[PDB]
């Protein structure tokens, strides 16, 4: 099994391939646990987690862009919202939506795997579609 | 915070696979792959999916395409979109407590998959595909 085989590959297969360099793969995964709080340090959002695809556990960080899109607010927008109660109330709403979305997250994750640090960055999230179903049928020779 | 997880990953399985292929016992569950001519898989943690057909406090019974399974301890797991009512399609991460007459899990997470029906279309194929790629 190829690391480019659609619709997704497996972490256990990635690790067994013993990659020397940082490697992009797409896996279907959920968050087993978060491993830190949401952080805005550095001027950007980050949060660490352990995900599983059913074949392995993987420490990951999520990119700012993903967390901005779940919350509805960038770090600058969050800071600006502290300047006005009505806007800050909207950020709190966005934060609850994000917390919930991380709890329920189960999707295709494009991840950048650093084999030296045994961890990865999640670059993008994608929901499954009928093409994914068709690719899985084709891979199972059906 | 300082977290602690099952030693092994949540393997994707179907109810019938537990019901009929599991052996060993509490705390030493293993799944037979004698049919596919391969060695036992270790079975603490699982990833299972189904339609909720019964909900009662923190227990649920769920139906996947192969059969029913139970889940205990849902009052303890993270609450996302509420989905512990009949009709919801959900995933469960759990630990295997019994395999027959009816598979039973201790719940670690349960999360809603209802808002995209394509999860349900894919699930049985996912189980099969994952099983093919474990040596």
């Amino acid at each position: 099994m190829d690391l480019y085989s659609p619709p997704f590959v497996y972490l256990s297969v990635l690790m067994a391939s013993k990659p020397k360099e940082v490697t992009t793969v797409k896996v279907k995964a959920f968050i087993v646990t978060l491993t830190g709080n949401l952080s805005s340090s550095g001027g950007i959002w980050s949060i660490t987690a352990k995900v599983s695809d059913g074949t392995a556990y993987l420490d990951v960080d999520f990119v700012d862009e993903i967390l901005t899109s779940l919350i509805g607010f960038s770090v600058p927008e969050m800071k600006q919202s502290k300047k006005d109660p009505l806007q800050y109330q909207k950020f709190l709403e966005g934060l609850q939506k994000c917390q919930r979305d991380l709890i329920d997250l189960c999707c295709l994750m494009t991840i950048s795997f650093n084999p030296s640090l045994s961890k990865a960055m999640v670059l993008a999230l994608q929901d499954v579609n009928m093409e994914h179903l068709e690719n899985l049928k084709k891979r199972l020779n059906k | 915070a300082g977290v602690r997880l099952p030693r092994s990953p949540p393997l994707k399985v179907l109810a019938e696979q537990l019901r009929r292929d599991a052996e060993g016992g509490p705390g030493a569950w293993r799944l037979s792959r004698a049919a596919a001519g391969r060695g036992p898989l270790d079975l603490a943690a699982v990833w299972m999916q189904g339609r909720v057909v019964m909900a009662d406090r923190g227990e649920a019974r769920l139906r996947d395409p192969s059969g029913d399974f139970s889940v205990r301890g849902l009052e303890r797991v993270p609450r996302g979109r509420p989905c512990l009512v009949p009709g919801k399609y959900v995933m469960v991460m759990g630990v295997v407590q019994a395999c027959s007459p009816e598979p039973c899990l201790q719940a670690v997470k349960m999360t809603d998959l209802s808002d995209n029906p394509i999860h349900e279309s894919m699930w049985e194929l996912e189980v099969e595909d994952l099983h093919r790629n474990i040596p």
């Binding site: 917390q99 | 977290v3 303890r76 719940a107």
Partner: peptide
């Protein structure tokens, strides 16, 4: 077992 999602979750092992 223990998970964290903005609060701790204690589960039986």
């Amino acid at each position: 077992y223990r998970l964290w999602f903005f609060q701790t979750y204690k589960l039986p092992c």
